[PDB]
Design an enzyme around this catalytic site. Structure first.
Site, PDB file in Angstrom:
ATOM      1  N   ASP A  71       0.851  -1.222   0.000  1.00 12.96           N
ATOM      2  CA  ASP A  71       0.000   0.000   0.000  1.00 12.96           C
ATOM      3  C   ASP A  71       0.871   1.251   0.000  1.00 12.96           C
ATOM      4  O   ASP A  71       0.450   2.251  -0.568  1.00 12.96           O
ATOM      5  CB  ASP A  71      -0.919   0.059   1.225  1.00 12.96           C
ATOM      6  CG  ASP A  71      -2.262  -0.618   1.031  1.00 12.96           C
ATOM      7  OD1 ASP A  71      -2.388  -1.461   0.124  1.00 12.96           O
ATOM      8  OD2 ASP A  71      -3.174  -0.282   1.785  1.00 12.96           O
ATOM      9  N   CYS A 108      -2.286   0.521 -13.296  1.00 16.25           N
ATOM     10  CA  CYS A 108      -2.366   0.628 -11.812  1.00 16.25           C
ATOM     11  C   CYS A 108      -3.602   1.518 -11.554  1.00 16.25           C
ATOM     12  O   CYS A 108      -4.608   1.317 -12.224  1.00 16.25           O
ATOM     13  CB  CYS A 108      -1.005   1.079 -11.275  1.00 16.25           C
ATOM     14  SG  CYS A 108      -0.276   2.513 -12.123  1.00 16.25           S
ATOM     15  N   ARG A 164       3.384   2.426 -10.843  1.00 19.34           N
ATOM     16  CA  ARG A 164       3.735   0.978 -10.938  1.00 19.34           C
ATOM     17  C   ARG A 164       3.782   0.561 -12.412  1.00 19.34           C
ATOM     18  O   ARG A 164       4.644  -0.225 -12.781  1.00 19.34           O
ATOM     19  CB  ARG A 164       2.751   0.142 -10.131  1.00 19.34           C
ATOM     20  CG  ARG A 164       2.645   0.606  -8.685  1.00 19.34           C
ATOM     21  CD  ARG A 164       1.595  -0.177  -7.979  1.00 19.34           C
ATOM     22  NE  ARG A 164       1.281   0.400  -6.701  1.00 19.34           N
ATOM     23  CZ  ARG A 164       0.274  -0.016  -5.944  1.00 19.34           C
ATOM     24  NH1 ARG A 164      -0.512  -1.001  -6.350  1.00 19.34           N
ATOM     25  NH2 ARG A 164       0.050   0.561  -4.782  1.00 19.34           N
ATOM     26  N   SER A 165       2.875   1.083 -13.220  1.00 19.49           N
ATOM     27  CA  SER A 165       2.745   0.782 -14.666  1.00 19.49           C
ATOM     28  C   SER A 165       4.039   1.173 -15.382  1.00 19.49           C
ATOM     29  O   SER A 165       4.501   0.450 -16.227  1.00 19.49           O
ATOM     30  CB  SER A 165       1.579   1.535 -15.230  1.00 19.49           C
ATOM     31  OG  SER A 165       0.340   0.983 -14.816  1.00 19.49           O
ATOM     32  N   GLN A 171       6.483   7.794 -10.343  1.00 20.30           N
ATOM     33  CA  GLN A 171       5.840   8.880  -9.553  1.00 20.30           C
ATOM     34  C   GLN A 171       6.766   9.333  -8.419  1.00 20.30           C
ATOM     35  O   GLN A 171       6.576  10.437  -7.927  1.00 20.30           O
ATOM     36  CB  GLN A 171       4.496   8.413  -8.986  1.00 20.30           C
ATOM     37  CG  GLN A 171       3.342   8.541  -9.969  1.00 20.30           C
ATOM     38  CD  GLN A 171       2.021   8.149  -9.355  1.00 20.30           C
ATOM     39  OE1 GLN A 171       1.703   6.973  -9.213  1.00 20.30           O
ATOM     40  NE2 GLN A 171       1.226   9.140  -8.994  1.00 20.30           N
TER      41      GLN A 171
END
Ligand SMILES: CN(C)c1ccncc1
EC number: 3.1.3.48
Length: 281
Positions: free
Chosen positions: A180, A214, A220-221, A261
């Site tokens: 998370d 994601c 994450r992508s 990110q």
């Protein structure tokens, strides 16, 4: 070599600094179609928009907009569609894009609920005998089989065009264990997962581009596409150490904003590539 540059940035703790250089160097292109008021409801986040030049169009004459970008890596001969997690109102759009682009695989890097909020609509069936009908796009989706493992689930789905009665098999690759907060401690399970997507033939030029998502389709992508491309460039080049991960990230940011990110995600991407290179040499 990046292994040496890894220890450098790490021992000097300069990850925030590298990451900011990339932010400042990144392409900026118009995203006019994304901000049309008619498209407001099709975007999960107002600050994450596809560029007009690289956006996927839906073939429906009505409104062709989806929050999805084609990333073309010319030297690696790899394409990817990066997209947001579908919204309740765009699940039909998502599957219509998968149908039109002739994609073989969907790669999902998020859980439907993270930090007590919905990151994504439940866009596939949970039971064989409870199929889903998308009335707006005239498609039927059936769960065929589901293989649950510790770190990821693979599902076999049948997508049927109710208009033409054609059917295709879609593979859904679901990484279930991204924490998370932060990034995985070790990249081993992520690399395993990436090798499993490759083995499936979902990444192959025979098929349409893989669809990767994601929540926003940038963090994450981004890590997924960046790792796959770098490892492929290391196989292809006479000198594997000529591959600069910052150069490749910047080339990918010409096609979709914001990919990677955080400086954590940048560090994790280096580590994933470095480790992956051992399994490739
Ligand atoms: C704009 N947005 C994130 C949503 C649209 C429709 N239903 C829920 C959320």
């Amino acid at each position: 070599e990046m292994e040496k540059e890894f220890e450098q940035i790490d021992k000097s703790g300069s990850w925030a600094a590298i990451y900011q250089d990339i932010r400042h160097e990144a392409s900026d292109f118009p995203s006019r179609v994304a901000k049309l008021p008619k498209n407001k409801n099709r975007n999960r986040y107002r600050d994450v928009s596809p560029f007009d030049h690289s956006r996927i169009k839906l073939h429906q004459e009505d409104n062709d907009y989806i929050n999805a970008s084609l990333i073309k890596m010319e030297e690696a001969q790899r394409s990817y569609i990066l997209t947001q997690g579908p919204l309740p109102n765009t699940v039909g759009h998502f599957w219509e894009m998968v149908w039109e682009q002739k994609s073989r695989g969907v790669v999902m890097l998020n859980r439907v609920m993270e930090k007590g909020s919905l990151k994504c609509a439940q866009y596939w069936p949970q039971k064989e005998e409870k199929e889903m009908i998308f009335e707006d796009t005239n498609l039927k989706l059936t769960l065929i089989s589901e293989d649950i493992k510790s770190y990821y689930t693979v599902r076999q789905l049948e997508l049927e065009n109710l208009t033409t009665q054609e059917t295709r098999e879609i593979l859904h690759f679901h990484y279930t264990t991204w924490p998370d907060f932060g990034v995985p401690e070790s990249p081993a399970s992520f690399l395993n997962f990436l090798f499993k997507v490759r083995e499936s033939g979902s990444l192959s030029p025979e098929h349409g581009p893989v669809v990767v998502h994601c929540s926003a389709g940038i963090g994450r992508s981004g890590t997924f596409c960046l790792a796959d491309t770098c490892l492929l460039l290391m196989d292809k080049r006479k000198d594997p150490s000529s591959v600069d991960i910052k150069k490749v990230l910047l080339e990918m940011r010409k096609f979709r904003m914001g990919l990677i990110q955080t400086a954590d995600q940048l560090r994790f991407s280096y580590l994933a590539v470095i480790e992956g290179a051992k399994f490739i040499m």
